[PDB]
Amino acid sequence: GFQRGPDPTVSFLEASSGPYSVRTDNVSSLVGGFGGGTVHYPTGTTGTMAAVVVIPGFVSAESSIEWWGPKLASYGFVVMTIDTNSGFDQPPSRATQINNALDYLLEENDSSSSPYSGMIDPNRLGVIGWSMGGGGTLRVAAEGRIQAAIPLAPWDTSSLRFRNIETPTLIFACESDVIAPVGSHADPFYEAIPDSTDKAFFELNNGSHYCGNGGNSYNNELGRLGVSWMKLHLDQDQRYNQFLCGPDHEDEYRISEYRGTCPYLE
Ligand SMILES: [Ca+2]
Ligand SMILES: [Ca+2]
């Protein structure tokens, strides 16, 4: 089907990058209506691949989610990281931002002249979203548009909107998060999602609010689990199930808590 790349291994997933060289396309904030960002897309590939929007969502961010761009794109995804300081803020605006970003990728995908023209399978959209962008991600997951959601230290005001999420959703919770404390955000958000949904809750041990952003102490977990999430759900690549369903995740030092609804794709 949509499988791409070799049979995965942990080292393959935890390597600083995936196999593909990644080219980038800078998106000015003046186009797309999502604050600008960077499209990351692999070279050397053929066929279409899933597209992932990676959105920040912490206005006073000292750093952002850009690690996800090259990291995820290098495994065979078109991955657009959205810039910070976009004028977007609260989770509802972040959902709008995500939708605008997804529109933009699809629009560029549909262009004959985009450097990644035709590279995106519009049916296979993922969103990784941090903080209020994680709330936005959960909101877009609830809107039914996307095929995989990875809220990173999500912040939102209510879990009720998430009670019917059917989108495969991996929430990276950050154990020590004081911005979006897990007990008030990532945890109840995760628990709001039906147990019928393919979902995972990975609380990263001692994680600050930034713990899911990558380029940090959690690269292994974020890469191994997050890339697997996208592979499994966006590519229907069952070869990545082994990293998500099977392992005793909490045995990992870096994973303070795991919840999930394995098996997936039943
Ligand atoms: Ca701890
Ligand atoms: Ca299940």
Numbering used by the authors: 28 to 293
Give passages from the manuscript.
Ple628 required 1.8 mM of the substrate to saturate half of the Ple628 present in the reaction, while Ple629 required 2.1 mM. We observed that, in general, Ple628 has a lower activity with all the insoluble polyesters tested than Ple629. Similar to Ple629, Ple628 had poor activity on 3-PBT. We did not detect T production at any time point, which indicates that MHET was not further hydrolyzed to T and ethylene glycol. After 72 h, Ple628 released only 52.9 ± 1.1 µM of MHET, compared to 785.9 ± 27.8 µM of MHET released by Ple629. The Ple629 protein was only detected when the biofilm proteome was examined separately, and not in the whole community proteome. These findings led to the hypothesis that Ple628 played a bigger role in ecovio®FT degradation than Ple629.
In this study, we recombinantly expressed, purified and characterized Ple628 and Ple629 as marine PET hydrolases. As predicted from the sequence homology to the lipase and cutinase families, Ple628 and Ple629 both belong to the α/β hydrolase superfamily, and the central twisted β-sheet is formed by nine mixed β-strands (β1–β9) and surrounded by eight α-helices. The catalytic triad S174/S179-D220/D225-H252/H257 was conserved among all PETase-like proteins (positions in Ple628/Ple629, respectively).
